[PDB]
Amino acid sequence: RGWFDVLDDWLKRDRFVFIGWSGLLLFPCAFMALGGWLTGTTFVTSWYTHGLASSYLEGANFLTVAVSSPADAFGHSLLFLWGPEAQGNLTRWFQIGGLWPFVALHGAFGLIGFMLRQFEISRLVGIRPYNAIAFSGPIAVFVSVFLMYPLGQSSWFFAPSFGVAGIFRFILFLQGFHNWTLNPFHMMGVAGILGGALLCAIHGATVENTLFEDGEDSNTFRAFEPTQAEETYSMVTANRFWSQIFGIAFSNKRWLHFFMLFVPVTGLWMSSVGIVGLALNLRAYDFVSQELRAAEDPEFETFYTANILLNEGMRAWMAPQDQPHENFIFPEEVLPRGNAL
Amino acid sequence: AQRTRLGDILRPLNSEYGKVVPGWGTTPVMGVFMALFLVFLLIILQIYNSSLILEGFSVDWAG
Amino acid sequence: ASLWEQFCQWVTSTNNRIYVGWFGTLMIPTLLTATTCFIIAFIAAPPVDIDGIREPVAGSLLYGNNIISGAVVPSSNAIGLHFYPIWEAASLDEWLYNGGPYQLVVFHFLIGIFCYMGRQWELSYRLGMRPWICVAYSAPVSAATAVFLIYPIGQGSFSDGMPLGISGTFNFMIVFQAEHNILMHPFHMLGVAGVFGGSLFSAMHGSLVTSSLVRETTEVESQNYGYKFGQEEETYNIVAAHGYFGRLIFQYASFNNSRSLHFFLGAWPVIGIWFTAMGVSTMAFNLNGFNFNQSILDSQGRVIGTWADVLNRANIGFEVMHERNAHNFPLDLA
Amino acid sequence: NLEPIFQLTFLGLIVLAGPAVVFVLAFRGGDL
Amino acid sequence: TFGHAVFALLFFFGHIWHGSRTLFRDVFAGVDPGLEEQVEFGVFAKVGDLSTRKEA
Amino acid sequence: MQVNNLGFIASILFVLVPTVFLLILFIQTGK
Amino acid sequence: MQVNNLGFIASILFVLVPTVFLLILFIQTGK
Amino acid sequence: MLTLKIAVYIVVGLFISLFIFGFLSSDPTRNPGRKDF
Amino acid sequence: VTYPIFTVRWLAVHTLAVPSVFFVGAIAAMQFIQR
Amino acid sequence: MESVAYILVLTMALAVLFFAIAFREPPRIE
Amino acid sequence: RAWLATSHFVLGFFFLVGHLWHAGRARAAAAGFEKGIDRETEPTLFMPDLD
Amino acid sequence: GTTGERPFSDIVTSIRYWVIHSITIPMLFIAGWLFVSTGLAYDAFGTPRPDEYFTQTRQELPILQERYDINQEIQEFN
Amino acid sequence: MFAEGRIPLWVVGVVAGIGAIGVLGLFFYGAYAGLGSSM
Amino acid sequence: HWVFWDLELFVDPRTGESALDLPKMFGIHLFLSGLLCFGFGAFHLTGVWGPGMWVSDPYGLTGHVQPVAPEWGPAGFNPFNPGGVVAHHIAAGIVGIIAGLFHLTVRPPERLYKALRMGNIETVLSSSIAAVFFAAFVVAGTMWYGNATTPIELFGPTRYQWDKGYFQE
Amino acid sequence: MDRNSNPNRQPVELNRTSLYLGLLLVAVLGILFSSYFFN
Amino acid sequence: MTPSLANFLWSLVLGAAIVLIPATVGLIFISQKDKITR
Ligand code: CLA
Ligand code: CLA
Ligand code: CLA
Ligand SMILES: CCCCCCCCCCCCCCCCCC(=O)OC[C@H](CO[C@@H]1O[C@H](CO)[C@H](O)[C@H](O)[C@H]1O)OC(=O)CCCCCCCCCCCCCCCCC
Ligand SMILES: CCCCCCCCCCCCCCCC(=O)OC[C@H](CO[C@@H]1O[C@H](CS(=O)(=O)O)[C@@H](O)[C@H](O)[C@H]1O)OC(=O)CCCCCCCCCCCCCCC
Ligand SMILES: CC1=C(/C=C/C(C)=C/C=C/C(C)=C/C=C/C=C(C)/C=C/C=C(C)/C=C/C2=C(C)CCCC2(C)C)C(C)(C)CCC1
Ligand SMILES: CCCCCCCCCCCCO[C@@H]1O[C@H](CO)[C@@H](O[C@H]2O[C@H](CO)[C@@H](O)[C@H](O)[C@H]2O)[C@H](O)[C@H]1O
Ligand SMILES: CCCCCCCCCCCCO[C@@H]1O[C@H](CO)[C@@H](O[C@H]2O[C@H](CO)[C@@H](O)[C@H](O)[C@H]2O)[C@H](O)[C@H]1O
Ligand SMILES: CCCCCCCCCCCCO[C@@H]1O[C@H](CO)[C@@H](O[C@H]2O[C@H](CO)[C@@H](O)[C@H](O)[C@H]2O)[C@H](O)[C@H]1O
């Protein structure tokens, strides 16, 4: 028995936490990511990269802590601890935001390790690997948003920061600078996510309300056995209910569950395509016909033009504090504002 | 299966389907070459990223 | 045998292709009314003075909108919460200028969706089902009522209702963040957990079932033909699915009970949408999200900013620019 | 200040009171 | 850049799909009609290995 | 409105070509 | 050249619609 | 406007009446299970 | 019966729990820092 | 004339809804 | 006013949810199918098809 | 049904587990406490104490601008 | 306690939950005192 | 090739079924890829028999097609050095010729043949799609950031030139 | 050379439900993207 | 020869010696000690 097969035996043993071959990628990298997040939000400042407090040590709370993105002066430098910026100095590495590429790259490799774990356990158990294929949606979102978007921009600075309010900032940033609500790729993502939530709710409620009486208790949960061969709920009654209520219904359980996979994964992939567009400032910002009409006719107003004015105001009022490296000095008189506000 | 002159010239190049070396074969040498390839990709990536600066040139349009 | 009993038997009939029921007697007229008026107004309604400042906003397709920018614009701020049916206008053109179609569509739609919920109960009762699908549908109903009724009531104007359009919806969201910081509101945070998690659990459940389907076909035909409608047997191996997922994380994180799992699937996004509907319904009374502006000060007392302060700068930009001719006074109090 | 000391002491007494009732009923086998 | 960034990202799905279909070709039409004892927890010392049964 | 001059033909073809593909495949089903 | 603005869409539809009709009817033949 | 108001009041009153008298017409008995009540 | 004490599950439980309690004590100390 | 295209695509969607409900493939137990 | 109004709106909403839950369950329990569909006397299996 | 390890409920209800964890969990807690309260965390991570966000010679945000020489930049920032 | 050589699991859960709510209450106290309290 | 699908070349002479020896096919195709890569580097780009490639000044004022000598030092890994592109194609073509020879001559290990399902053409589809997206990410990056192979006289300036005031300075 | 019949031919199917789903997908994609095509 | 080149080469050496090599040695050791009886 060779050493490879003996190691394969040990890694694939049935134990509380399955390791596998993929765990060699998954478990250190994820532990580097999450601990790297938990360290940063507890201890590490963004004062030299952002002019912001972002740790519990500085007085921020769970909503306001972040592992913030690096300083814009580094560009897309990978910011290794041994790299030409920190030069092995741990404290300087923390201060320049090296924890952001630490968490983002260990997270990337950890997500790769998790998908590899899905494939490995699917092969060892004996099932089809559709859980891994479904997990490609979150990988597409992570890769587009945290890697491809700042790579198209000036630096890692404009990547989302690993925090609650930092993510909120990134969200509002893409509104005011990219009009990301107006992007059909995002609108398809919203359709997919809200549709997946709808499908989750409607499928769970439909199953729980077409259950067969297979027990005597009012507690219906114990009338199910995992080794039973029969369906625990009526597909026929559910189909008749939704056909008379809604007009159409599922008649095929396999298509139901594939659709439950398909909707939010397709939403994630489409929104990722839009984010790749925003990486190069290829925005759905304007409808040029409505802009030319509004420029020549000052009675024409739509909700689209109102949103354009909203984005203009947010950009001008947010940019000096959000991009402190640019040294935007906007005097009070140049800020767009309506009457009395 | 229809025979053709070209097919008769090309036939010994599609005659060893399924032929394997038993065991691990040349997989260790292959893994060494993959490790060297990974080191090469790391080098050219860090040069392009300006994380690896070498004398004699600068990563710039002038060079 | 009576005419009324025959009509009661037809209305409550399970043999109807679309179930009517007594809730349907209200839902069908209201939803048809709101649908007809919405389609006509979305195509052809003249501009509406939504802010009450004689600055009419064009919402319909024929007045220069596209599908994205088009909307049925909310009623005038001059109307406020006043009831504005067609017969209280001196002409149809005045009713159109003041945003009457919004009030007509919204009021009928809201009645229609409450009767849709009741009709869901009603058909579940006539089919011998358990009755709680309507409880799950109460979460989108609560959210629709929050944005179309409850937020206008709290703010004192239907003009503050979500417009019936795509870009009008975006305008509503952005102004709402400017005025309420809904992103920093823990109930929206539960909504987001509701929809993100609901999509996660939709994908996991669908992926686990599709992963564990019983072999009943060839790889030529679609796997969905391995299921027959009305078949008694289960079409996937729940034990394989559980044996996969309890090794993906660990054994007791995985549902071995299909009823428990389906309950969780139903309950999680319903509870999340209930919470975010209450967030919008409570921000109607201006109980806003968390304010951490200048929460951190240095030992001297100089402000040390956080991400909340940068978010607040973004909120200012929206706020000082929105409804830019409407305000005459220093505070946006409603 | 001593105010917060008393607050915590009153709160700790109230917090232990309920589990005390449960614990004496479980230790002596009362009608749980 | 846009075209090639978007295609590269979509071609990641294609890799995972076709890699999966390569490695899981025996179960593409569905799992084996048994698969009851193989997937249970604690029965075998190794996950899926039938020869490593504990019998305990 | 000063819309794109190719917008109408792009919209009609973007709808019509897959509509035609689906109708072709549906009508031939059962052959 | 200052051609008719509807000429392109008219030409493409005038060709495409009966082309689609013939392709639909041909592919379903033998059902 | 007054003719429209009277017509709408009549239509709404007729539909609401139908709903009330429909749910008053032994609606617990209209179910596939037990109907004694 | 006669279970092993130290396992892979043990290392998993402690790898997270031990710096979790360290960090929680740190944040608890942070609550008393004055301006 | 972009309004014609918008009306056409919305009408196509609504007509597909009508035909998908009223002339659906009927579910049958076999 | 804000605290009292928000509280009671939320309370009122959740008590409507509770009304729907208990009314629906009261109807099903009085009609005898609150514990699920009986497999032998499933009502849809005796109904004609819709189309 | 069990992978072979000792069940968690048998462990956390045992006397030996609590003899050990009655010391090990408070020691980890007060170790994190002493990491903060001795000020060691500030020097370890470079996080400013509340009196070093601004100095007497710098009243502005110390935003990094050098590509490489950030050690000299931060020292200058103090 | 009652169980021989075995502390009851509900006692362990009561103590752990009391400690968890205590540290959460300490964090919510620190929201209103010291750093991050805006005074 | 559609009409005359049933060529004897495509059938295993041992069995009667259609079979493609995918490792030998890889060796042949890699050898030829190596030959074409080496020739494009050594003849086309060097101008020995060929035009060379577009080079320019750093500010995109004097762009023209010229023969480029290979750069065999570390400056051959400067992405703005066209001599690095010539060296690449000579050295990678030579390595492709050598690797083609190995793959024409040495059979796969049984562990790798069974592990990667080398009797299935879908494994080639999966790995080829993988290499193809790797290459697509690379060309997207070198288009966006700038390269000797993406000159500004042909594709326009980059966003980073405006960002840093490259031309202004 | 002979023109022999290929045995690898298979019929393609698209059922009516799949046609309705596809037509709805095409129509809503047209609804979504038409405004951007017109710009 | 630059400081960044030296740091990259040390990164290779320490990535082997800290992460890769003792994980490899410990995995081989625990696999050969804790074997499966078939
Ligand atoms: C399998 C797990 C794994 C993976 C994939 C990564 C991956 C990564 N780490 Mg991470 N890391 C890990 C575990 C892992 N790490 C662990 C467990 C720790 C804690 C100790 C760290 C701590 C850590 C830090 C502190 C940093 C990284 C960084 C990085 C990135 C750059 C790494 C690099 O260039 O190394 C290059 C090294 C190799 C590829 C290994 C060498 C491979 C060659 C082929 C062999 C060399 C042989 C050698 C000559 C033999 C001599 C040995 C001896 C006999 C002399 C990359 C994303 C950096 C980062 O995140 O940047 C932001 C960074 O600064 N890592
Ligand atoms: C109705 C409202 C609504 C809805 C439903 C959505 C829905 C969506 N938005 Mg949008 N958004 C909206 C309004 C809305 N948006 C508005 C008004 C704006 C302002 C313009 C935005 C701005 C916005 C931005 C800026 C972005 C989105 C994105 C997204 C997508 C997020 C996908 C996701 O789950 O990422 C969640 C993240 C992942 C799935 C990545 C991987 C997650 C890993 C697996 C987590 C692992 C955790 C680990 C196990 C341990 C964690 C523990 C730790 C937390 C303690 C989704 C399609 C994103 C997008 O399009 O991405 C492509 C995006 O970047 N939105
Ligand atoms: C969200 C609204 C709503 C909905 C969907 C239901 C649904 C239900 N109710 Mg409940 N009901 C409600 C609110 C609601 N109720 C309120 C607020 C009260 C207190 C006044 C009651 C009092 C009540 C009693 C006393 C009983 C029910 C019962 C029932 C069940 C049987 C249906 C029935 O008898 O109709 C009753 C429906 C109503 C009383 C109101 C329905 C309101 C609809 C949805 C919208 C109304 C719009 C309006 C009519 C049109 C506007 C008018 C204007 C334009 C002129 C069913 C689950 C019965 C049951 O079986 O319980 C066990 C029963 O006996 N309900
Ligand atoms: C059943 C489990 C129960 C366990 C019991 C645990 C209790 C621990 C709770 C709090 C711990 C600290 C108490 C507060 C310290 C007192 C300081 C003070 O007086 O005021 C300190 C500050 C202001 O301090 C002011 O100082 C003045 C001069 O010194 C005066 O003393 C004023 O009276 C005083 O208000 O006020 C506050 O911070 C009170 C708000 C925070 C109080 C507790 C927050 C929430 C606590 C628990 C809720 C947690 C919920 C999580 C889980 C929920 C689900 C179960
Ligand atoms: C962060 C986590 C890190 C994870 C690392 C954990 C281990 C990883 C496993 C690696 C697997 C690699 C291939 C599988 C092993 C194999 O080929 O078969 C095992 C072979 C043959 O087995 C022998 O083979 C003999 C005959 S035959 O060859 O099989 O026919 C047979 O008789 C004998 O019983 C048998 O043992 O054993 C060896 O000869 C070992 C050689 C070393 C393995 C080569 C890997 C190459 C990587 C080099 C990296 C450094 C290079 C430096 C670059 C700068
Ligand atoms: C960074 C870095 C690193 C790493 C590290 C690590 C990896 C670590 C870690 C770490 C960790 C890992 C930490 C931790 C933590 C934690 C915490 C901080 C916790 C918490 C919590 C809480 C507070 C909770 C609470 C709650 C809730 C809220 C709900 C319910 C109840 C309870 C109580 C549960 C190294 C050195 C390598 C290198 C350098 C860099
Ligand atoms: C659980 C939390 C985990 C997060 C990390 C916790 C560790 C605590 C941080 C300690 C920081 C020590 O502080 C800093 O350490 C680095 C070591 O990298 C030292 O760095 C010094 O040695 C390194 C090693 O060759 C040189 O490359 C570097 O140029 C030099 O400055 C600094 O002189 C010191 O100021
Ligand atoms: C699977 C991949 C995982 C890999 C990631 C794991 C982490 C890798 C750690 C690499 C750290 C290298 O860090 C680097 O080490 C060298 C060697 O001490 C240090 O170098 C320092 O000490 C050496 C030792 O004589 C001196 O010769 C040198 O002049 C001095 O600068 C660098 O200052 C430090 O930055
Ligand atoms: C079937 C169920 C029940 C439905 C039957 C009800 C039929 C309609 C009842 C009320 C409709 C008409 O009711 C009548 O409306 C007009 C509105 O024009 C009101 O009139 C009010 O406003 C008008 C303006 O138009 C003024 O000119 C008038 O001085 C003022 O009183 C009357 O005060 C009211 O009595």
Ligand SMILES: CCCCCCCCCCCCO[C@@H]1O[C@H](CO)[C@@H](O[C@H]2O[C@H](CO)[C@@H](O)[C@H](O)[C@H]2O)[C@H](O)[C@H]1O
């Ligand atoms: C710091 C370490 C981590 C601490 C975490 C503690 C978590 C504990 C929370 C769960 C509380 C449940 O508490 C426990 O529940 C089980 C559930 O059947 C009850 O039931 C138990 O009854 C007796 C013991 O009384 C046992 O023989 C029986 O097998 C068991 O079911 C126990 O009487 C109760 O003590």
Ligand code: OEX
């Ligand atoms: O309308 Mn609609 O937006 Ca409720 O806040 Mn005051 O109003 Mn107007 O301002 Mn801001």
Ligand SMILES: [Cl-]
């Ligand atoms: Cl506005």
Ligand SMILES: [Cl-]
């Ligand atoms: Cl005002």
Ligand SMILES: [Fe+2]
């Ligand atoms: Fe299901």
